[model samples]
Target chain A: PALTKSQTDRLEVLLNPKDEISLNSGKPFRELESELLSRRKKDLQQIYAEERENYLGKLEREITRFFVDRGFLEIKSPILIPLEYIERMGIDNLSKQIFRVDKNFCLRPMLAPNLANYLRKLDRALPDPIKIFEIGPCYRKESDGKEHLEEFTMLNFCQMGSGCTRENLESIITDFLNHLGIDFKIVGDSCMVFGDTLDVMHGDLELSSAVVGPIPLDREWGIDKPWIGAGFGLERLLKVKHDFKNIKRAARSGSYYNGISTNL
Target chain B: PALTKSQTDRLEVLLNPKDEISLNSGKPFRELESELLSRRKKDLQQIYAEERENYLGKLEREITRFFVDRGFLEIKSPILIPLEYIERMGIDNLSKQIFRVDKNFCLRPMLAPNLANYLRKLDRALPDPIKIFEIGPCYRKESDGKEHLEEFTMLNFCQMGSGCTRENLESIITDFLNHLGIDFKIVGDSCMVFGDTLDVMHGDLELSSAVVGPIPLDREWGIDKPWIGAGFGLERLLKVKHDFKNIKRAARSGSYYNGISTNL
Candidate 1:
């Protein structure tokens, strides 16, 4: 994984570096790193390269492989879920959140219901313990916020069958987060029509949620055993991890690649 | 550069294989190869891996890396390009195709205008022969038909300034396609704002259009140098390369990953 040119090189901070303000001999390093980084002569290319690491890009590859390595098949579902299907999953009274494609069709506000629509049909063909993941856009009419967006990228994966419980998926989630260099938690957890849920928190955002469901919604989709799953907003994770106040920069449409403003 | 396990494995079609059939095993291999592949099992996983080899996904990676290898910086602009920008490019009358986000924003029906908007602003910070690319979604409201997608993916790239010319980019385009394992041509060309354009054709579809210009567009955006570029619809490429009649499976929200239907 390490090659000579591929390895990142960094300059050591000053012996008495204080917040990089013209290298004042005694101040906090944190205070000046941003100031130092913006300097024209300070390895500008290096700064861009480091910032352009495209963390979301990095995390996307990492998370995909992490699942592939564990044999979870990646699949994508429709982004336009019918309102009938949307309401059927029990996310009642949320029609206002969706962008209507017309009267009958609307942009999917979440990936789950489309998945739930497919799981029963899919189970007939594939064997049990159907481990699947979906990565794509989900939409809503969101108000201005650092963590919310009208259009967003979502990464949702799940495993179904007996015994794939809270304990098991929670452990897997921790490992996945840890591998990606993220620190997370279960603090904002809540309950749904399914059962108790797990919320994965990173910084101030609910980065994702893990639901250990022998879910009440199971029968609505068709006979199901238990399932464990999580849906993470890649941009929100990008928001919390990189601390970007304007998330537009984290999206593919954003000129910000690594953490560096692409104007560099 | 060839290494073990890096290369893909493939099927041996005929030593007059028998399973190529009508369930009676009575058909000749050529007669049923397509039908057989379109069926359930024949290696259910193969459907995914092969169909999903979603030619677009394959080509996108190939093309993006080819650009990177040649020192082009990748960047993005909005997908919800305002109608004002769309018309500025002289798309002339593009109203019906766009999906609206109210009356203010519409899903980008094409990628070029955003690139045009970017080139001027971006040129100030980046050096010339300003080379950059964007691979993302574009939308249109279209009726069901072969080779048309209401939602599709686009890969657009451009190089402009000192010594960048039509001949210069044609050579680059040819080499880029060759490296991507794509056999393409500029033979059956067409017209656009940039004078007679060069078209790269794969099967039935125009993979992309290439033009070298001190483009009139350069004037539109306030520039005075030569530029060359192409914008390819990934789904059209998918339709031509993968022989899919239903491309709903090829989009981001597609159930078909690698062109393999996710129904499996």
Candidate 2:
């Protein structure tokens, strides 16, 4: 017989434990409920995974110092941005994946649009090989999976002017991953927005994506200079680095602290 | 007669509508529920209040430019910090108001702890007058009021070294508020941590608080230098500026877009 509607609801509150028998067994409702209640008590007694958050905080500092020491200016911008910025990136058609705040603005799905504006305004003023990086939360109505977060953090860095080549992009990624002591492979890939690109992958998970521009899209922002840009999912990095079972463990959330579920 | 448990639950989901009779009337369950259901339908059809969020984005840019144009450096740091940072701020006694992630860390209740570390490390490396600012989210288990948000954004700016006086702090705040076109009165106030402060108030709402430091708290970070610091609640600024009924409308949330509820 199928599980009762009340039993299904109770299991969801427990975040669905991995014990197969508990999930699939044709157990009595009272028996299942008591078993799940006891499991919740056990879950509540587990220690807070303090090291994971502490490591993430330290990791960010390490990355910031790496960029700042290399002369990249760090920028922090509003997460809500103009709708036209999406059109400028040529991704307005992918509106289903975006979170619209209004007719004129949406929660930024990526960091490129703001970076493009910064580049256009400061291009001549700042010295070349103009380097800048931003690390912040981005939003999307993405797939509901262990690998996905509706709201995620991204670290996007870019360099324009001389020596901005595909080879240079790979070299930077290699050095960055090496600095963090993570193993990764760079392979050719294509992006819906940027066309041809390089993807940084760790096992089956894609951690970051890189693109070299002078691409046709640059014309939208009135740029004709060579540039190399890469965006890394910060949570993905932490997940891959620490072997987390779910990306939510590395995300900004109240539901989970580090990897431990808070529902209990 | 008291509202049934189901009716009370349904009303809470509507975020408690302000209609007088709808709340107090001992009307039939089906009738009141239908009336509320119609209200929910009407609310869903309303347009998104996009201008509020846009204005917030613009306001942030305006404030950032004001600081940058005056030579202050912008810093972005982690939202999570060591529990010791709180102890250093002398507010550990108020732990009931903070959100702890683990035994060792908590979601930062304020920006001052991180700013203190920045000042100590960058004190001698930078120029005599070290000026820096950061704007980001801070968390607390605050009161459930129209003016409170469990997660809120803070704009904290500090200036240290020569000319870091109470007078200079007031002047900076006056100039800053004038730049934003926000009219505020600076009045003497006492902080649990800093002892004395000049609060930037808009009628009854407190917009920001400014403090000049060479206080006893400096011993924790190992320095003794005059400093001026002010922390402004970004959402509170927007709320006061626009007369928003609820602070959540100005916060980073998915439940409400601007002031309109998302539940249909």
Candidate 3:
């Protein structure tokens, strides 16, 4: 005896009880469904009593204030950006992973293109040492998984014109983590988009990709000054901080509220 | 003869069941619940198949680009702020209407204080007519209802130093609504905080409150410049645009996604 295909589909949608259970010998399907529903209800109550606020949104504020206190101007980058910026980053071949809104615009896959646009414009207008940061959603199309999100928050900060050294970038990341009381390590890595870069790692998770400029792409973007920038997965930061089992638990989703399952 | 309180409460949660019904002589309570649930499932399916995307999130992108295209710098304002800012607005009498995070800090009820702070500093360093816009969440402790939300998205934009007249402010709002293809009428209103404002009305609902500079509170915030600003409720804009029955449906919530009920 085996569960019908419809029953299996229903069970998958209602309660993904991720364990081997034979309907031939184990509890009845109706009984298991009721048990799982009750368990989820209790879990939500427990999270509500213990964790009152969404730490993901809280971290965004904390990090924003940290940078602002140190003279960083926070910018809200447009989520739908021109496709040409993707070409500027030399990742136009990866269009399969980008969400296109139209022929000319796509939901931004990263904050760098828009931030780079800001750097070019503001560097020419504003005085030396232009410090800016943007924390918002970036889109990516990927296989469904716990490790990645179709839409995820990104924190990208850059310093242009003066004192934009690799060492300065490292110290800035250190100061940020120290302020948040987060333990982290920086190691050299190669980015598909930015080429040779420093990766911020916590345990086994890659938290951020930091790059110091004068890269080959700089000339193409009209940037000729010393600059350093880093793009951090804000969800990854919250996931590591709270020890979330799934990255989706730390993101804006219909299935979870403050990492608690809504069972929708 | 009547629904037991337990059964009534269950119906309220399972479905608002928002109509006059004689459950005593009409359909059985179980039958009604089943029918409502089925209706909701179909309703969700219809929305998913037809809409394909959340318009609330879409309008956010649209409005952001509109401001950015007009030489307005988009800012990400902090949600939490010192309570002193509220006091500066002479709204200390309304402390009971605020959601305080701590004794000293409360979730920002508006974006004016932070923007005003920026205006003072940026006015000192940069050139005239500093145009900036911020779209984010603002908090208020209010009675639960369709008309208002405890947490709502606000779009605040301001221009300082140059062309900051009452007529110019009206033109800015006109340009914004015209860009969105929304028909709006501006009427004068007295605000408790800013005194006088031009209210952008779409039919009956007040979409935004536009204020021009040299208000009484400007001196308190160390801003001595001519300026114009408007605080538009992003949720109300979507609500008016989509003809949503409830404003909560247009906001970020566990209960609703893209103005569609999630039945969580």
Chain B TM, every candidate: 0.75, 0.79, 0.82
lDDT (Cα, tens digit) per residue for candidate 3, span A28-95: 67776676556555654454344433455457767876776787755654554577878878885767
- Give the range of the ten consecutive residues with the poorest summed lDDT in model 3 chain A: A14-23
**Residues A101-180, model 2: lDDT tens digits:** 42576668899887776565445444566677777778777779978887778899898898899888888899899988
Clashing pairs in 3: none
- Output the worst ten-in-a-row residue range by lDDT, candidate 2 chain A: A45-54
Deviation of model 3 at B226, angstroms: 1.2
lDDT accuracy of residue B234 in candidate 2: 89
Docking class of 2: incorrect
- Candidate 1, superposed: residue stretches over 4 Å from native: A1-54, A80-83, A191-195, A254-257, A262-264, B1-39, B46-59, B188-195, B222-224, B240-249, B252-257, B261-264
Residue B30 CA error for candidate 2 (Å)?
73
lDDT of 2 by residue, B103-210 (tens): 576667888877777666555344577777777777777779988877778899998799898788888888988877889888889977989988889888899888
Stretches of candidate 2 exceeding 4 Å from the true structure: A1-58, B1-152, B155-264
What is the model-wide C-alpha lDDT for candidate 3? 0.71
Error of 1 at B202 (Å): 2.3
Could you tell me which residue pairs clash in candidate 2? none
lDDT winner between 1 and 3, please give it. 3
lDDT of each candidate versus the true structure:
0.62, 0.70, 0.71
